[PDB]
Amino acid sequence: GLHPAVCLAIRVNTFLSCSQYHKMYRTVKATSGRQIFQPLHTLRNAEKELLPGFHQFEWQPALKNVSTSWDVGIIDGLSGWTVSVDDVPADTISRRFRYDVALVSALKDLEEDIMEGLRERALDDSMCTSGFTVVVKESCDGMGDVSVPEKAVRFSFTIMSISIRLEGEDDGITIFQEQKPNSELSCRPLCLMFVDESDHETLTAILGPVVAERKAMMESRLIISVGGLLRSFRFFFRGTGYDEKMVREMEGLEASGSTYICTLCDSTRAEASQNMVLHSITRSHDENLERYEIWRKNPFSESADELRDRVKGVSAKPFMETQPTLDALHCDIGNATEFYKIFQDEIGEVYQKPNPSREERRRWRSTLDKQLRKKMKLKPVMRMNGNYARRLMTREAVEAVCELVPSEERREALLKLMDLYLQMKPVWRSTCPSRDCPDQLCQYSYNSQQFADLLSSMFKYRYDGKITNYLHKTLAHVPEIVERDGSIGAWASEGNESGNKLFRRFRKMNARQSKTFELEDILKHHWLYTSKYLQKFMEAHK
Amino acid sequence: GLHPAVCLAIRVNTFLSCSQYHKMYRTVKATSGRQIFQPLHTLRNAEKELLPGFHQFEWQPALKNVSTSWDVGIIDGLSGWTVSVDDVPADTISRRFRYDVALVSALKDLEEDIMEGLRERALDDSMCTSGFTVVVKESCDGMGDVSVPEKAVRFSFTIMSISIRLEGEDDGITIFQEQKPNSELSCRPLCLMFVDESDHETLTAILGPVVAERKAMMESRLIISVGGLLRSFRFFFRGTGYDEKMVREMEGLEASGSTYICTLCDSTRAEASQNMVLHSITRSHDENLERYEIWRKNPFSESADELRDRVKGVSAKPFMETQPTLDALHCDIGNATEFYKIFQDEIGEVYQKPNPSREERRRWRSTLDKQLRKKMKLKPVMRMNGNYARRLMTREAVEAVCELVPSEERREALLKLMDLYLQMKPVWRSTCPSRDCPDQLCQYSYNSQQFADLLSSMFKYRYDGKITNYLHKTLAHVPEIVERDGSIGAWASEGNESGNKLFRRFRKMNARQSKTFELEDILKHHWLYTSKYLQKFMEAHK
Amino acid sequence: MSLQPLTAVNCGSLVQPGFSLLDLEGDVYLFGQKGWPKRSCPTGIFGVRIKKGELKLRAISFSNNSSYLPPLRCPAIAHFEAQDGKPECYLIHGGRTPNNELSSSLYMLSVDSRGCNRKVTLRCEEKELVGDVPSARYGHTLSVINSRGKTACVLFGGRSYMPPTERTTQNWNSVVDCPPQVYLIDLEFGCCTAHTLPELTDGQSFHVALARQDCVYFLGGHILSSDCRPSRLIRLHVELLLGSPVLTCTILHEGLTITSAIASPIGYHEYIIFGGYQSETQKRMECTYVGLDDVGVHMESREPPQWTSEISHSRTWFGGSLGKGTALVAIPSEGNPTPPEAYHFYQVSFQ
Amino acid sequence: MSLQPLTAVNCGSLVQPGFSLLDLEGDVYLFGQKGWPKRSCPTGIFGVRIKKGELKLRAISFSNNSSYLPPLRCPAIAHFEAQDGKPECYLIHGGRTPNNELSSSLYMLSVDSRGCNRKVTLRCEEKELVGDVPSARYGHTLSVINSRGKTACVLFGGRSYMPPTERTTQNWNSVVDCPPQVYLIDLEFGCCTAHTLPELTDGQSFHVALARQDCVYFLGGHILSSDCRPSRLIRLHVELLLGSPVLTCTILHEGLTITSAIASPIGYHEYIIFGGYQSETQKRMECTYVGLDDVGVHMESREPPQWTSEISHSRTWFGGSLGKGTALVAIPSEGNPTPPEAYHFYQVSFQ
DNA sequence: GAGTACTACCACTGTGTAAGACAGGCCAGATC
DNA sequence: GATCTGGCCTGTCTTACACAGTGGTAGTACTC
DNA sequence: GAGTACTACCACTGTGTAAGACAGGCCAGATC
DNA sequence: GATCTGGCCTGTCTTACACAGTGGTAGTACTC
Ligand SMILES: [Ca+2]
Ligand SMILES: [Ca+2]
Ligand SMILES: [Ca+2]
Ligand SMILES: [Ca+2]
Ligand SMILES: [Zn+2]
Ligand SMILES: [Zn+2]
């Protein structure tokens, strides 16, 4: 006999229907039975402890314009959209958990690990039930091709760390910290929609409640029966799982090959060729709000362009607080597509032939891809993905490319370039840089300095007035970000985008299939898929 | 502990990848272990008793131009296509077993049931090892939409019955007969291709060996070690799982709304409106061969049309023996689409308004579909499928339609029509009519007589010179076919088309995915999917 | 009364069912659009050019003293007519932001200068409101009235979100009708007054309101509490007395069961109603001439043009008046792949 | 030499890579279609009409005394030229059936009567063979020779299936070269003789054979035993002495490494070779003029037309001569969805 | 000691897009 | 009739999007 | 006696095609 | 210049092609 939880997890984690699992259950039950698996209806009853809407909690003070019911499950995302025909239509199909309920679910699921974190720090448990601090990574991304694409947006969050500040004289004793923050298996879905990223009208209509509730939770303290005792939690949100496109869309910036390039600085694009490394972090959500009011009222009666430059590119009203940070994965893909282009433009020579054709660009791409296929055994890709970018930023792929550029200063140059890049990639790819690559963390300014200056010198034919955004961020902003927050790569969107992969599997084998239900099903199955408690049943001491 | 066979079947029958099954095996093995499931490699080792190419057999006399090796497994179907570029290309991707090997596999799989049929008829077993007769139903169909369609053809066979004639003074003691001949789970695939039905050039190049082997096996006797003893089998093939398009294509007839309508008779289309019920079966494979000889040599020097008429529509050289019969399922679909049209032309008035528009026909279709939705709660279908056709030929759907035709003479007419049809549908839909519905078999001539004559009378406006092929077959040929071959519906291609549904499943989840391998994989899993021995492990006393 | 299908050549992603058409100095300006203003057009207001069956859009600019201006979605829209001091404006209040807020500010939008090369500059003065201000709402209506001979501006109807105390994150997109008060906005100064009416028992939204020379006729709205569509017609008569604007009202016997209409002006005080929707499933397909005098309103069916099959089988539709008895209408379009031209366009014309 | 892309307006599906073009009396006839003969055309032979950059196909009919005729796929094709008794025929033997059997019968295909209205009728006489008959084969070749002054017909080369005793159902589509004999077919009577040649050590297939006035020049074939494309040109010289047609042969120094070519005739005994394939991966892209006299064959590169990118990046290609220095070429086409026009067509022309 | 099981190796689809900012080119066209 | 200029165009640059997850093979942990 | 499990109920995509024979309409076009 | 006729066209008819297979609900076998 197995515990019903274990078999629930067996059914979620191996992608089985009800009817397939049942066929197997009756089969293994009539040969050698003795019942091994549980029947279906006792897993439907077993899970209701794991979905959102089961534990009782309460906030103090009460939540502002949030209801006091604590047992709500899966709602439809329209949030009471009155469906008259004269208003803008209610075409959207969306489903969601009510944010705080799913929070309290994910905490009651990490109740084992907060308790053993308490016991392991040799901290007492009847005391210190008042001052817990959870740090929550939220994350949102659109997603195409779910056979028109009928694209999907999938807003999720992940519990990053939970530390303790009670009772006083200190600042915080970390109790838990996420060992694998970029995994799917720690990226919990909160809300799904059949929406395009781009139409800000539907995204804000569905996500308006969610941000209202987040804004409502930053003041109150949560109260949970955790370990027998009622205890008090407070929350800090770090919005970091946004690719850059979306950060600009939702911070009122203009997208994305603009004159205003940095999300963190005020420097123009050409001004960030001259000075590649000297920029302080200035932008904040509340200053975007103040500058947008500069834009609306125009209190000094300036023209379109004097206004745009007075406000450094805030022409839209910010609608979502976002942590001013970077995304490790998309930084990788940008730098890989940049280096791929640089190699393509170095096989053919374009520091001699300063303006080349399109068809010689195609010749050079084909010869680069053939060369990278003969040694290094790579195929060509439609679009840069993570594995290709990882394999592409190696010493020996550069070394197999350098065999085609003839001048051995271009060669030794870009070998110096690549090895500089490898000397500084681990500071922004690390899950924690200060512990796992500390000398690179302190050598970062010097390393990036020489990288910038070598681009200035031996590539000025390319970077006279135009730089890619990630290159800007990676060269001017990394030391200051990682000193303020502690880590990079830990906060990436990877886990979210990786979760889209899962989302695809569920859409096929577990569809209703109907729009009114397909999200309620993907959503339930995805939420089970992530609860730690069923993942320990998954590992079972490995 | 479970037997490795049982768990192999658990993994095939519930649609699980190696890595999904493994995740569950390791999971249920570290909670509560004691190993319940077998590991993967012992299932890989467990099945080679069940795939083709395992048991030793031999033919007497040896097989004509068939090799003597008995341990051959999965071949690629090109059969040694020399891949010069100047010849027609070897573009086709195809896979197949080797006909006789899969035959001997299917018999060694029915070893238990032949022996139990021997003991249950109280027949001795060390005697009677020479006179066995197996009746094999083979079956071929094309198949679209496997995401251009990249259509597929899937040539399969099914063991229908096995009887005994040894030793003399008798004709045959049936020992096994198929209780459920139209199921998938008794339809064993033999060969797969990425081919269109229509291009006769690739189909004959891949299927040429197969027909050569079939033609080679009708003379010899097989020799198999079954129940400890070497015993002798003979074979009779009945090619019946072909829809009509295919039978015409494969018998040298012209397709399909020709002037020669019947596959079994010589009557012209117009001549099969005057005489609806009086036609004898004349056509045979060998007469097609000698009429094609008439066509090619033209020994009496007549014109195109006089020659076509001399030869009754044999203008192509027949390439495959096919049993001259009908397909119960496709007969259903033809008669349902016919009655759907007749209703459409009775809601609107036609025997009054002898020529209507297409847009009146569209009005009438919409109103018919609305009526059938209000009562009978059916939705409208793009195309007729088996469930719709079954539900459509009910008394109460006619009864809900008759509420829209105004004259209660047309009304009571087509009520008499439908109930006649229901009085004679079970003779051709039955798995065995002579035992299960014998009086309709006796009353069939009379019932069809009155059906024909009521069409002659009250529908002359529709059937002056034009009749559908199935209506012809069902009205002129059913008594003689079911007298000669014992049953109808038992030989349909429905079970084959039903296995196309399975083909789809495997392509989605058990793919390599690559063309060179995808067929070797679909083919292995489909063959396992059907072997009786794993289905008894599936039911295990229910 | 002819409709001819147009085709919008380039730029069609910049139009959404609720938008506004402003007729300024013979030139027609599209206002409100999907999204925040792109940087192809950092102002968000477009000039409409109809030529040879083509719809072309041109980026308008502002002045230096002008305030910029979010793309309101179903705002209330007042043709301020040419008089003293500066003709000839266009009051906008308040509509719904592109980020779904509701606007609580009043904008006066005028023409400012020309050319050089058929270039026009507009301007926006954000008019500050002191009251008694009206609450942020949308689908309401604004009209201008003249009495002896001061000019004021009457505002009535509309939907809003539920009050911020009862508004819940499962109510967040729910709407309720705002209380049925009328607002007198004088436009200099920015003084607003609210007046309650014994006869105006319940709020309504998406109605047309037509004013002439101090009398306003409110035609058929949509009431959302009872989901009824009243066919009655309201006529209210103001007079701006020193210095309290007395305000009377009457229910007139029969008006018109429409919602969300297109009122093109053809004559001096004569319009044509192009039809939004009659019932929740069935859009109003017939045109109606509405002349109005000092006896009251008069009203006659004209016969509608032959609606194409395409504009007949659409589920929804919207559009607006290019003025002078000509209007633009739009139909959602269905194709696979997406066209991605989301809307087919027609041009309708009177006589 | 110019190439101009055609487009085949209708009936795209009735053409397959191995097919034949017979030039009869100025009119060109396509022969050997995919499939058995549909009833659009129960004869299976089509008339080719080129106009306006369009390819049009017209159903030809037969006579009453004619035998009908399966669609051979790569048959051997002999222009019997106008002499006594009945001009001017076209010998076909034997190619490959639409149901992939190999043809063991010989068909004489002549013109018979016209009109009325540009109607032509052909006829087929199935000619019976008495020998020493040749085995069913394909890709071989047939030519006509005149010696003092009788006319005979020489047949040599080709592929076949493995002998019926070693043909296995895993060898079924495997081919081997048939023994390198030559066959003298006299055309009345149906007397065939087989002759073995010390110089002809191995069979070959898909070669071009050109004959003139009792000498035949075999140009580059493909040999499948050794997977080489020999460039050695063969020249054999017959003479019909009653009763034994004595037959000599020489290997000439250098010919041409081609396979599966297009030989259009332009002159009296002068052809142009449009090219099949040089190596297994690389199709022969240059044209070659081949004049032949009684000294021997002479041979010169002309410069080829500028092959479009489309006919340059195809993997395979085929086609045939519309005669008189004009030919038709075909390229497989790739698109999604399928066009379903499977082949793009070009018309090539000399001078 | 080997023989088991596990887990990591490989082959592989398909080899383009989709919107948008901005530079620059330049031209309708309308006034001067 | 000359300008020129505001606006259309074209190309180019930049930011995302698809491509996992499945069979078989085999080294390798690893252990009866 | 109920309470378990099993098995059958319902919702539901999407609401057209793809080839071909033959009748008939008819017209290029070429001869008479 | 008249025919008419063989050939193109158009529509119509007939033969196949997708739509299972998955959650949830609940009667119901059926039994601790
Ligand atoms: Ca992404
Ligand atoms: Ca089928
Ligand atoms: Ca993105
Ligand atoms: Ca079929
Ligand atoms: Zn910066
Ligand atoms: Zn018949």
Residue type, B350: V
Place of tokens 């709402």: C137
- A266 marked ligand binding residue: no
Output the CA angle A154-A160-A166, nearest 5 degrees: 135
Number of domains in chain D: 1
CA A535, CA A185: separation in Å to the nearest integer?
8
- Residues B351 and B490: beta-carbon distance below 8 Å: no
- Sheet with strand C209-212: strands edge to edge: C209-212, C215-218, C233-241, C244-252
Query: Residue B170: which H helix or E strand, with range?
Result: none
Of the candidates B179, B144, B130, the one whose C-alpha atom is nearest the C-alpha of residue B158 is: B179
User: CA D175, CA D177: separation in Å to the nearest integer?
Assistant: 7
Nearest of B134, B300, B321 to residue B214 by alpha carbon: B321
Among chain C residues, the shortest Cα distance to A293 is held by C68
Q: Best residue in B27, B38, B146, B379 to probe A by mutation, most A CBs within 10 Å?
A: B27
The method of structure determination was cryo-EM
To the nearest 10°, report the CA torsion of A356, A359, A362, A363. -90
If phi over 0 gives left and psi between -120 and 50 gives alpha, with beta otherwise, what is residue B312? Answer: left
Contacts of B3 in chain A (CB under 8 A): 31
A253 burial class (0-12, 13-18, 19+ CB within 10 angstroms)?
Answer: buried
CB pair distance less than 8 Å for A542 and B9: no
Residues of A whose CB is below 8 A from C175: 82, 87
Domain boundaries, chain B: 4-47, 57-242+493-531, 249-310, 328-484
From residue D323, alpha-carbon distances to D5, D54, D266, D277 in Å are 18, 18, 7, 21
Distance from CA of A501 to the nearest CA of C (A): 24
Distance of CA B243 to the CA centre of its chain: 7
By C-alpha distance, which of B134, B132, B125 is closest to B166?
B132
Which residue do the tokens 């001052």 mark?
A: A131
Give the neighbours of chain C: at least 3 Cβ pairs within 8 Å: A
Q: Which of A100, A165, A173, A169 is nearest to A136 (CA)?
A: A100
User: In this structure, what are the phi and psi dihedrals at residue D176, rounded to the nearest 5 degrees?
Assistant: -135, 155
Q: What is the largest CA-CA distance in chain B?
A: 85
Give contacts of C42 with chain A, Cβ < 8 Å.
304, 308, 315
Size (chain C), residues: 351
How many angstroms separate the CA of C315 from the C1' of G15? Answer: 17
Nucleotide H18's nearest residue (CA vs C1') is: B383
Long-range contacts of the stretch B423-426 (C-beta < 8 A, 24+): B423/B447, B424/B448, B424/B451, B425/B393
Phi, psi of D338 (to 5 degrees): -60, 140
Give how far B522 is from chain D: nearest CA, Å: 21
Distances in whole angstroms, Cα of residue A60 to Cα of each of A54, A214, A219, A233? 20, 15, 9, 10
- Rounded Cα distance between B202 and D99, Å, is 9
Rounded to 5°, the CA angle B88-B93-B99 comes to 105
- Report yes or no: B154 and B189 within 8 Å, Cβ to Cβ: yes
Give the Cα separation of A507 and A503 in Å (integer). 6
Radius of gyration of chain B (CA): 26
D10-CA/H10-C1' distance, Å: 15
Bridge partners (DSSP) of residue C251 are C234
Range of D117's domain? 1-351
Q: Which residues of B are annotated as a binding site for a divalent metal cation?
A: 141, 243, 497
Strands (E) in D148-244, as ranges, are 150-156, 159-161, 175-177, 181-185, 192-196, 209-212, 215-218, 234-240
Grouping H, G, I as helix, E, B as strand and the rest as coil, residue B207 is: helix
**Which of B201, B179, B452 shows the shortest CA–CA distance to B319?**
B201
d(CA A48, CA A69): 17
Cβ of A199 within 8 Å of Cβ of C62? The answer is no
CB-CB under 8 Å, C18 with A205: no
Query: Could you write out the DSSP letters of every residue in B244-274?
Result: HHHHHHHTT---SSSSB--SS---BTTHHHH
What single DSSP character describes residue A186?
G
**Which residue's entry shows tokens 């009177």?**
C350
* Contact (Cβ atoms closer than 8 angstroms) between residue D79 and residue D23: yes
Classify residue B144 as exposed, middle or buried by CB count within 10 Å of its CB (0-12, 13-18, 19+). exposed
Q: Does C169 touch chain A (CB under 8 A)?
A: yes
Question: Of D326, D21, D175, D323, whose CA–CA distance to B86 is shortest?
Answer: D175
Q: Enumerate residues 6+ apart whose C-beta is below 8 A from B365.
A: B344
Closest by CA to C219, choosing from C236, C228, C229, C232, is C232
Cβ-contact B312, B291 below 8 angstroms: yes
**Would you call B14 and A23 a contact, using CB atoms and an 8 Å cutoff?**
yes
Strand E proximal to C52 Cβ, under 7 A: no
CA distance A193 to A152: 6
Residues D224, D202 contacting (CB under 8 angstroms) = no
Asked if B31 and A6 come within 8 Å (Cβ–Cβ), the reply is yes
- Show the DSSP H helices in A393-531 as ranges: 395-401, 408-429, 433-436, 438-442, 444-458, 469-476, 478-485, 494-509, 515-530
